[PDB]
Design a protein around this ligand. Structure first.
Ligand SMILES: C[C@H](Cc1nc(=O)c2cnn(-c3ccccc3Cl)c2[nH]1)C(F)(F)F
Ligand SMILES: C[C@H](Cc1nc(=O)c2cnn(-c3ccccc3Cl)c2[nH]1)C(F)(F)F
Ligand SMILES: [Mg+2]
Ligand SMILES: [Mg+2]
Ligand SMILES: [Zn+2]
Ligand SMILES: [Zn+2]
Lengths: 319, 319
């Protein structure tokens, strides 16, 4: 069960995603669907809802970073944004359903090695998706194979036309998570910002791509205590890759290279050239987002810069 | 064993594809690869190249239209164009290898039901490819599945950098055969066309995309009875899809409805609004195309228009 305290904190981006076990996370995800009025407006069989969440969980891999806790993390942040930015006043329920469901399924069956590995290693994935966002494509397919089994199909009671609309929206959002397209997408969105139109369908599609992108890389928005472990879990996975990459001939990226990257320098670059700019333009649309999320981001940047001095200082010694 | 008479008619769009058998065509294909000096300039092992073309032939299905012969026509037409338009003076042997390989592989393992059926019926392909060019994506995938085996890999003797550029090219061409992108591709082309530039890598990519598109739907460019049978084979496959759709209760395209489609009306629109316009544009770059390909297309159009009059009169005589 969840205490009214937990259920209360579940709305803030300060929620401690580490305090829980799969079962307790499944319950929170479940709470979110009810509380958002999704179970209600889509006639989601409450039993199916919980069975779906179990099948989703079952399909996430036990990786150091790209795992079910990450999934929950992204979904929970998305949930926070819905209340923080009062999204239910700008988005239809079908839009919210898409944001939430896409967030929960965006990394289904992730293997721990990104697209670059897949393509360079000429993997069965990279071959099947002709080197086009192979991971993202795969997550999305698994997401719909799951929804294909009537028992997990939380969309049973939605008419075919509504299903089509929801499916197309989820695919757009999940593929939009591939960071390779980060600049392209930010340009498109900033271009629409010059005069945003909440009634312009294309304007909203980009805003939704931006929102799920925000949640998927929002770790640094959370409290320093909650955020740090994630950076280490990602680098574990990244090293796991660059290890296998160098011992296979396949090239390696600087940010995944032991001899080149450091938690601090990395996060200073990520926070300044990715996270703060992105959340900056989003603030022009949502002012409350500046205090609640752009603040910890600045703080986080500042802190990793102070940690950079000490890191460099220790480096001098081991030389 | 091709005679010298054959090796000569094989460079023209008047070649009768309906004569030869799988065995013989496989020879013509093999010939084309040597004749174009792809073996030479790339170091293709003449034995591997012969196995590969067999690996390929096996992977095509026994469909009335989308079968190994269609494959043959597309590559044979592509071959005719390399000679007619002297493409070896404009394109590198790399691009020529891409164009020919792409043409041969473009419909690998086609099931006989188009993307609309896949999408509407929510097939594995549709689910797997997220409704995005599911058939074409699958073809290009089965293509590289074959080049994956060490025994069919006709690219084995190519540096890493080389294989990359080839693969990307092939993915681009095969994915460009999806008619759903016709208007989009024709536009990008007609644009670059306002000031073509055989130097501009993007100008050339669009030309290669337009070249394979021409070859994929170029049946009407051939002689009246080499062409006519093809229209029949396509409808046999189409009616095969609509019968199954009606049965399964899925929507039916008009041009696949026995009570609506007539060869006459069909080929009139297709020739006037799809074929002729595309070749006219290509003729701006290669004037010699007008006499060898536009000519038969204009005759095809007129013939079909005359054929529709007959059909109107004939039917009026019955009501
Ligand atoms: C090199 C990474 C930088 C980085 N910082 C994050 O906070 C963060 C959040 N998500 N991702 C991420 C994860 C997977 C793929 C792409 C990204 Cl972007 C991140 N990557 C790190 F130093 F290890 F942190
Ligand atoms: C309804 C079709 C129209 C048509 N005419 C062709 O000559 C032609 C050549 N290729 N394709 C074709 C085949 C498969 C998919 C798309 C196209 Cl475009 C054709 N489609 C037919 F009148 F029945 F023929
Ligand atoms: Mg991902
Ligand atoms: Mg095709
Ligand atoms: Zn993710
Ligand atoms: Zn074809």
């Amino acid at each position: 069960l969840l205490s009214p305290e937990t259920i209360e904190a579940l709305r803030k981006p300060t929620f401690d995603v580490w305090l829980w076990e799969p079962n307790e996370m499944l319950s929170c995800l479940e709470h979110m669907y009810h509380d958002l009025g999704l179970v209600r407006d889509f006639s989601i069989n409450p039993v199916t809802l919980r069975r779906w969440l179990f099948c989703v969980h079952d399909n996430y891999r036990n990786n150091p970073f790209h795992n079910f806790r990450h999934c929950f993390c992204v979904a929970q942040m998305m949930y926070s944004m819905v209340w923080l930015c009062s999204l239910q006043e700008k988005f239809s329920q079908t839009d919210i359903l898409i944001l939430m469901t896409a967030a929960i399924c965006h990394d289904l069956d992730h293997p721990g090695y990104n697209n670059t590995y897949q393509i360079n290693a000429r993997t069965e994935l990279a071959v099947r998706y002709n080197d086009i966002s192979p991971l993202e494509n795969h997550h999305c397919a698994v997401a719909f194979q799951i929804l294909a089994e009537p028992e997990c199909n939380i969309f049973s009671n939605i008419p075919p036309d509504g299903f089509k609309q929801i499916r197309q929206g989820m695919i757009t959002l999940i593929l939009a998570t591939d960071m390779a397209r980060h600049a392209e997408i930010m340009d498109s969105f900033k271009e629409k910002m010059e005069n945003f139109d909440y009634s312009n369908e294309e304007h909203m599609t980009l805003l939704k791509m931006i929102l799920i992108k925000c949640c998927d890389i929002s770790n640094e928005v959370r409290p320093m205590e909650v955020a740090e472990p994630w950076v280490d879990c990602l680098l574990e996975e990244y090293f796991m890759q660059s290890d296998r990459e160098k011992s296979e001939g396949l090239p390696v990226a600087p940010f995944m290279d032991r001899d080149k990257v450091t938690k601090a320098t990395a996060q200073i670059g990520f926070i300044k050239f990715v996270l703060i700019p992105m959340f900056e333009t989003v603030t022009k649309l949502f002012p409350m987002v500046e205090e609640i999320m752009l603040q910890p981001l600045w703080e986080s940047r500042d802190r990793y810069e102070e940690l950079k001095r000490i890191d460099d200082a220790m480096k001098e010694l081991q030389k």
